[PDB]
Amino acid sequence: IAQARKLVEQLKMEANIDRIKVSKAAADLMAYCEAHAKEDPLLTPVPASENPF
């Protein structure tokens, strides 16, 4: 059947796509955390004087 051929082709094309080490792709989130750690209001509270809303 054509479905089996399509599945085999998808499996073949989903295997040779290269990879990277987990630590290198896992330190990116940690770096991004302090990349924008000062503009996050819900993390670091801001003074209430910034308008009564």
Binding site: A4, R5, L7, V8, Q10, L11, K12, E14, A15, N16, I17, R19, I20, K21, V22, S23, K24, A25, A26, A27, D28, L29, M30, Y32, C33, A35, H36, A37, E39, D40, P41, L42, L43, V46, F53
Partner: protein
Amino acid sequence: ELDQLRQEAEQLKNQIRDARKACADATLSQITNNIDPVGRIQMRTRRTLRGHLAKIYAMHWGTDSRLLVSASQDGKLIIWDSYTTNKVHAIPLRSSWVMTCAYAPSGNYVACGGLDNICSIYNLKTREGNVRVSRELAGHTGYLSCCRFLDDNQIVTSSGDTTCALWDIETGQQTTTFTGHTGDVMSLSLAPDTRLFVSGACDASAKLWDVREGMCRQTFTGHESDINAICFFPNGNAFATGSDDATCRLFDLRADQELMTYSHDNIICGITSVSFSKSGRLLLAGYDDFNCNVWDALKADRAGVLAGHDNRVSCLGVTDDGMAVATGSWDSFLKIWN
């Protein structure tokens, strides 16, 4: 015949499982064990919105972090004003079964959909000062579960007949169709570059789709029930999702492997909605235990509980500037936390 090749490529690794065990050193927990916890996060209700008549299933914010839209089973859309608790526009509907909302970046159109298998686009700013239906897009076969905007003239939809599609609003015809699932599709998220998007499924699997070319590139698994919600980390290189098995997980794309799990022992009921924060340090999730939890993404422990809804929380949202948390439960009161 081909079954043997499929088993060799899937059950016998062949870079699908062998390449997974050739990129992880020990665990990300070792790297993250040098970060102090966030602490105790306490949030209150600043303003409360009233006026709806039935349960709420979806809501969406705006580009200016001031106006928002929400849907209810009554069959109405209300454009609020979070600063002054004032109603600006109220739009009726032809079908009372509505599941999705949207809000154009230019602030001139509003999209909606539900069990009628048809997407509706309404024009906001026009002559004579009245809102009228502008586009009526049909052609699906299942039922819409999510729809999002790309610009003023392109909209992407996902259906319950195991398909996703992109549309041309000016003409009224499809351009590219993304097929290739087994179960229904329950969510959809757009990357912050207008180039790719991610779609979940009911077969405990998720996939990443390319818009122009129109074929899948990466598939991920590792759940045991229906996948409910999905989003992006605010960089375009990670995402996180939950399921009816009451477990949350985080996934990457470059490494192509699962990294973090969030669960407990008393969490029996499942998750409904997922949303992230500005810096990615605050993952916020809604359950059906009448509450809403906050996890820090790097760690695997709770840091805040948002109580105050009498019924089940159904929709969650955060702004672009970073100062709001909007919640909508099965009652008729939207809540804003800051």
